[model samples]
Target chain A: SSKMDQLRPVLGRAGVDALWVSAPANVRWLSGFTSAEDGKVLVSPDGATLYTDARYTVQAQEESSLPQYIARPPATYEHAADTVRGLRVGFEAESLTVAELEDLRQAWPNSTLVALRGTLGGLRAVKTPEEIGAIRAAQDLADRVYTEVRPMIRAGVRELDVAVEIETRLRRAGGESAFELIVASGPNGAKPHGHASKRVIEDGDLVTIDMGARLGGYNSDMTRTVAVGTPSAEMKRVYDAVLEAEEAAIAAIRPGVRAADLDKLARDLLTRHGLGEAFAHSLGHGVGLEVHEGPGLRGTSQDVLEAGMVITIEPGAYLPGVGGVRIEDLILVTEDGYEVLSHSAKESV
Target chain B: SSKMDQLRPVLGRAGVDALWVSAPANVRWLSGFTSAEDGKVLVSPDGATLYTDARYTVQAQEESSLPQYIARPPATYEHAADTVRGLRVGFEAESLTVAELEDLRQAWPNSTLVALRGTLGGLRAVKTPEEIGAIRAAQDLADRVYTEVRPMIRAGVRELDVAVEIETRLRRAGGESAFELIVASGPNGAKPHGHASKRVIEDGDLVTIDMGARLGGYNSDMTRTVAVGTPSAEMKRVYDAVLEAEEAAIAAIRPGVRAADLDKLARDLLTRHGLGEAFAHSLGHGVGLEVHEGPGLRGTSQDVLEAGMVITIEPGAYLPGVGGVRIEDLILVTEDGYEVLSHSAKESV
Candidate 1:
């Protein structure tokens, strides 16, 4: 929360007169309103005025502690343009699709759209005490629920059954899942983002449970791969490699550290075990209001870690027809160290 | 189904040389593959080829009866453009953003971008016997689950609790919700698409539950409003008016009927009760693989009712502070009459 208060001064230092927040997570981060009622807020160099829709007029009055105005659907664009006057409006060009940019261009034809590279990215990197507390609460709820439903993972149950049980526990604990529960079993685990099939889990099968919970807008993501019964030697080796790689990646994360370096830390470890290509997708990503937020952690990312940032370090290995192993954790960056928010068990069952 | 096969002649009649399918739904309807792996299947005036990524190379071969080619992402646009060979390519303009359209323009600078208005819509409107059978099976699952869960809606139960319970039953039955389960209690029901809250249901409260099931890519939407105890005279009046309006809307639906005329029936009924202004949004929308699909049933719709067209006729009234009531039913448009799909009890709990 203290970090949020520092946003205006940080933008001012970059010579930006105002910051135009458009993405869903960016809006939520600046103003605590989470509903998708479709509106944007203009954070002046002073971090004051907020504009939203009529639907959220009453909600904004209650939730947001700023000078706010209720705007009509298309009126918000005009209002933002009018309020900015002659100030340089910093925009997230990458987030703006061509159609949206055309609208912005038409509204503020004279105003310059400056690319505030790493403006919000630098701000969101380090989590304040309040932000870390929210993420910790979400992870705590998920850990308890996962433990409660661990007994439900038997041989004959469908993949969806495990998902439903986990969701039920999340609701009972007064929280909600940030995204759809991923309950990929056996070969289903080989394909990331695979649809949960109606396959029955067997003794030799490896089940990958990747899930997250949302509390007060902050999100927590964790993935754990476990054996149904006795494990194959290949499964054990892959699982250990993933766990070691994940730990090494987390160890390499600190303030001023490059995102790609952290990604290579895991990739190099997996490569040593001859499972580098098996890690198909990116290593991890920033986590906050939305499950996958800013500052992607991959080979292509050029992001640098800063104090107060929260991110995930998930390194995985998948083999077709056999099984896959993945270990993930949510970490908060400190001045010279890091804190792991997710405490889900990573041991092979 | 046979209705999809009818698309060939439709394209033949329109004089379209080649059909470039991009939207996920249209691709799924034509080819049986449901994966969102990037794909472009060009159905030449003569039945022809399918192009996709390496991820779906094996999948397209196994799932679709068409010949498939694996394509690299960057070169995909060029490859597909080369296959068309100066033919007039019909594209789904509505689904493509302006930026993507510009990219396509660069890829095939010489080829004409023919607007394929409602190209797949007419084909999708009339469900074949097999499509109807899948929809019926999904409806049965929804009806049974709602009947089983209704008893759990007591005074102390929160709105999210009911949502979780119904969703759990749906997944356990090998189905996932077509959309998010909407559980609004008291004045909260006044807002359609209200996110389920933790507010406990109270005695005499008007609780509106809107939910649906999606199985095998067919959807079933059903909404029912109930009172926790003996209702007020005013609440009963509103509920009865909605029931009559929904019945009138369904009664007016038949083969050769215009969708706009069906919507007018419900609007007229509600207008007669002096609650027309209270009835906002569309009367109902088409239901298929997506909850809201082709052939919208609203005052502005130009769609005609075909014999096998399946849709929903929902009528509701919302009083901002008091509460709201809605009754929805999925129905089959027959030659002479309509067959109701949703059979959940509508009486007060």
Candidate 2:
């Protein structure tokens, strides 16, 4: 079925005659609009229209296939008033600000304003063949860049310096840093989300590098913790434990597997190694247009693994005073098993 | 006065005993937390608290001085329920999504939740002395990089190549691109916000490069539209008109000037030159934590300039099939007049 055909049932389930897409990813997915946050999509029974401002007039023409309405707020709302009249128009509750909702209510007074949560999340969780190709191409570029910069991550280099090299390479290749690339070294690795800092790497330090490439609006994430000059056996053991846990979770990413059970499987592996407390965050998460999206891989997640779902399997062991170890891989769930998208070679301490 | 002292009157005006800050910039402004979108700030008479997940536990502790609560969603709300009980808690209606408001309502049934619009907008519009210095430093770096990359803007160069150099230099100097830098050339320049592309510059083509640097949480913005070999007489006239309009707006900037009037001053200049319709958008906007913020400079704006305010005075003329010209300068409203922060020299077509 076409995207619109798939979307009709979702609108029906929400008891809405139309959907107002505010989230950038959803707008891009449905209409091929590239203005991201600035562009909005109104899916009504009559037709779908992409609404943006004059700033995007040229780009909108080049990007979106939907009929374009070039205007800002109040005017943008008024343009769609006639189409949405006397209908239950569903707005993305997870995407719109309260002020925006209020404006919509005033603009379309004749319409029923309904709030729909995650209206297209389940549908977006599964990727089309084209989307998978985009992701695969992004990962391939990331792998090549990682291989080129791997040797430069030795002792005496600033965390920020390595990050700069990675970002530059990504840009030259027509890619972008998927997220602020992480280059946490030494004790900085203890902070899971610590971005590249001015801290200098030293001999015997454990460095965690989490980097990804964003190409064609698709992202690829991978992490590798390398040993500068191995000294402590304890740190090496922690690295081994993290590696084991990461691989174990990736090995179990077959179709219909509960995301929570996969998380537990990794947790149990680290727990038996006595590094359970050190493994602080979730097992993984879905990756697509948004780096972190649906089918969250956490203990509380109700999401189950399915074919065409791309996710990350990252398990880390953090020791505050000492150092930390994390190994991550981007995986695409297949019909029978899975394929690892990120091809960076994991280092053994 | 401290930020809390400034916030009380805002809370009082909204008739709320407490505030929940969800906008990432607002959260950073209040709590000094660097988690960006993942963090939130709860402001109450008792005290302020920074809420984040386990992944940001260490980062929150290091960056924020406010009391910290380490948890995700429902737990984050539950921890705050007691403090907000029996109080009129205001939430940022312009920042929080409807789904987030729903979660807050379900979590705190005992509290009266009020929707507040642009809760700290006015306070944030005026930069602190330290914030001004940070922005100045960023602009200084931007000027140096622009000078270095100016020679490469000749004919036969790709727009993406120039952008790559700007970004590479910014990153190497410990700065980041304030936004996706624009390097539109020739006909592409007709799009006001056209990003860097792979198009090769040609003789007699006019190229517009808008770039910025962000350092220490502050940003600098500037644009220079230059000629390649020798542009058409029509494009040269458009460049002169845009430059005249840009300078006129900057010359008129002072404390107590209405933002709308400033925009009109520039629009009227373009109108006299028979390019009124080509102006396409607003004059400029406030530049600080976020690239575009409070004190909007548009025909319908209610914002007024004040001392200590940092803003942009950008005026342009775009000709659809022909080239375009835009000259932007970051400005600081001083005690009596205004001071330009972006020092890159404007080119004469």
Candidate 3:
């Protein structure tokens, strides 16, 4: 089914005549519109009508196939709400702010505004072949860049310098950094979300690099921990533990597998190795238009793995005052097993 | 007064005992916490308390100087609401979704939730000395990169290639691209927000490059239109007109000037030149922390120019099928006039 076709049943199930898709990812998924800000797509049986201000009219016409309504500035929502004034309208609860919701309520007081909680997001988890191709192309570039830049990760180089080289290569290959590049070295690796800093890489330091590339509106995420020189035996053990946990979880991926069970499988591997406390954060999350999305693989997640879903399997063990080791791979959940999208080498230098 | 001191008065005026700063920029401005996601700061008379998940506990401790609360996943907000249970709590209407506000209401039914429409955003307009320094540093790098990449623009070169070179220089200089680099050539220049495309530059084509660099969480935006060869007389006329309008608006900047009046100064010049219709979009906007922020310089704006505010003065004339010309500069609104932070040469090659 087409994106609009997939959304029609969702609207019917929610008992709403239309959905006001304000989230950028949802708007891009439904219609090919890619404006990062200041636009909304009204999806209904009437078709997708993109509502934007004059600033985006030219770009919208060029990028989107749907018909558009160019609203005047400061009245963006008023014109959109008027299109479905007397109908039941569903809004993206995660994206529409309270102030914007109030504006819609005032514009069409007789209409019912229902919250579509993760209904559209749930649809995005199951990727189309074209979406998967875009994601795969992005991962291929990332893998190539990682292989090219591996040799430059020796001692005396600053973490920021390596990040600069990696990002430059990604841009040269016609993709942008999906997020801020992470090149945490030594103790900086103890923080899961540590951004690249000015800390210098030294011999025997364990450097964790978590990065991704964005191409054709889809994203790819991967992480690899490499040693500056030869790492200590203790650091080597931590790396092996993280790698084992990551492999165990990836082996457990298949259709209908509970996300929590997959998370526990990885946690159990780390716990058996006496490194469970060091392994922080969820095991993985769904990756598609956004780097992090639905069907998260966490201890508290109730979602089940489905075919065509792309997710990351990243397991890490961080020790304060020492270093951290993380191995991540983008995986495509297949009917019988999983295919690793990232093919970067995991050997520590 | 400190940021917290400045915000306390607004909370009192809104009849809220405390304000929950959920917007990332607001949280970073009030407290030093800079988590990209899953964090909120509760600002009260006592002090700012940072609430985040375990993933950010280590980072929050190192990057922020506030009290930290590491809540479990899916309970980040519940933990934050419990911190100020019995008082009226203000929320950022522009940042908080209707669903998130509802969650807060359910978590703390005894507290009143008020909307701070632009109160917090208004506070970010005036920059501190340190913030100005950071923005200036960003602009300095951008100016140098623009000068370095000037000679590389020529016929037969792809726009994306030029963007790649520009961004590489910015990253090498220890700053990141503030936004996606815009390198529009020929007819692509007709779109204001045109991103770098695969379109190849041709002789006599006018290229409009609007780019920025970010350092220390502050941003700098600048635009320059250069010719691959000698531009046509009509194109030169548009370039001169836009430069005149940009300069006039920058000269009009003062402590008490209305932002709308400054916008009109530029609009009136383009109108006198008979190109007002071609100059679409707002005149300019505030540039700091975020590229587009408070005190928008537009016809409907009510914001006043304060002494410490940093903004941009960009005016352009776009002619479809031909090309466009836009020249912008980052300016500091001084007590007397303004100081141009961006010092790139605006000469059309």
Best by DockQ: 2
Q: Write the per-residue lDDT of candidate 2 for residues B221-309, one digit (tens) a residue.
A: 99999999999999999999999999999999889999999999999999999998899578888888888887789899889999999
* Candidate 3 runs further than 4 Å off: A1-17, A32-39, A44-88, A118-121, B1-5, B8-17, B34-39, B43-88
- Model 1: how far is A134 from its true place, Å? 2.4
Model 2, residue pairs in steric clash: none
Candidate 1 residue runs with Cα over 4 Å from true position: A1-21, A42-51, A65-71, A78-123, A187-189, B1-20, B42-49, B84-94, B97-106, B109-123
lDDT of 1 by residue, B280-345 (tens): 568887787678887887788888888888898888899888888888999998879899989988
Clashing pairs in 1: A125-A308, A125-A309, A126-A307, A126-A308, A126-A309, A127-A308, A127-A309
Better model by lDDT: candidate 2 vs candidate 3: 2
| Model 3, residue B58: C-alpha shift (Å) | 8.1
Per candidate, the number of residue pairs that clash is: 7, 0, 0
Where does the lowest 10-residue lDDT sum fall in candidate 3 chain A?
A72-81
Mark the regions of model 2 whose C-alpha exceeds 4 Å error after superposition: A8-17, A43-72, A75-88, A118-120, B1-17, B31-39, B42-87, B118-120
Best by TM-score: 2
Q: By descending DockQ, how would the candidates be arranged?
A: 2, 3, 1
Give model 3 RMSD, 1 decimal: 3.3
Give the TM-score comparing model 1 with the true structure, all chains together.
0.87
> On a 0 to 100 scale, what is the lDDT of residue A47 in model 2?
84
TM-score of each: 0.87, 0.90, 0.90
Error of 1 at B243 (Å): 0.5
lDDT of 3 by residue, A92-133 (tens): 888889888877788778678998776765678888888899
